[PDB]
Symmetry: C2
Subunit: 164 residues, 2 copies
Amino acid sequence: SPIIWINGPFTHTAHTLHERLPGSFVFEPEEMGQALRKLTPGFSGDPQEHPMWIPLMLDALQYASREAAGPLIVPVSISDTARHRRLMSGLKDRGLSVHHFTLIAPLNVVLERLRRDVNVGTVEDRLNELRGEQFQTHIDTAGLGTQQVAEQIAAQVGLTLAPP
Amino acid sequence: SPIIWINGPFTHTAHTLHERLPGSFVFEPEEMGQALRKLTPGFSGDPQEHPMWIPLMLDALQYASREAAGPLIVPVSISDTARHRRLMSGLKDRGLSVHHFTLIAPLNVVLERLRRDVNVGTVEDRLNELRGEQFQTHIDTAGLGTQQVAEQIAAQVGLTLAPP
Ligand SMILES: [Cl-]
Ligand SMILES: [Cl-]
């Protein structure tokens, strides 16, 4: 069944798609990061930088793929071109064909989300990096609510959404 | 005196500019990397990933700046948006105002250079990353020889080149 892989600079999109695709399951890669941080002596920093995170999370994803009734929805937040490539070639290796998207979001929307929980230049650098073609397919969310992003993503992948 | 900071995906440009700007000096950041690799217990990997490389190379650059007769020319090869930012804010901190450029080079030119000493997708990912606006000012070298890139860079920074 389809795998919808959504990279973002921030979440709600994944949830919205989930609510409107019956049988769908939200696979959260961070669960593998939390396991690895607890199982590793002397670990610090971003769990998603653990050397085993990419291969073990993708192994789990492959198994999840075989068990999924409906579409498998995977929210990620990756900025590193090298980690992105590693992930993309890992999927391919495992024979997994995913619909992969990167959300291009307006600076003010990102800054406002971060504040409701931040150097503007550092945020803008990130958003500028995501706009690189190594991150295609791009979905620009300017002027769109979560419902409309979800709808746009579903249209691109050829999926019919249940109503809101 | 002006600092001409040239990031590239590959070298010859720096040399050409050097040959046509009397009094100029080519500052090679990799010399600091080689020192740090030899001075560090258990070190492996890219010397330019050494945690002290950014701050110590930039300290050296600041001193070089005070001693330079002519323009200071600095060839770098950086792909990491995070390392790029670190470098850019480090310069600013040290009060150094540099003319910073990233060469956008054609895929075939890069692939051909690498062969004369390589996964096409991995190269293309890198070139796509460099085209991000976090890497401005961009200089697209399509159709240009080293002499013409040098000339273009000099024009942008307001410098008169000696003849070839
Ligand atoms: Cl795209
Ligand atoms: Cl530019």
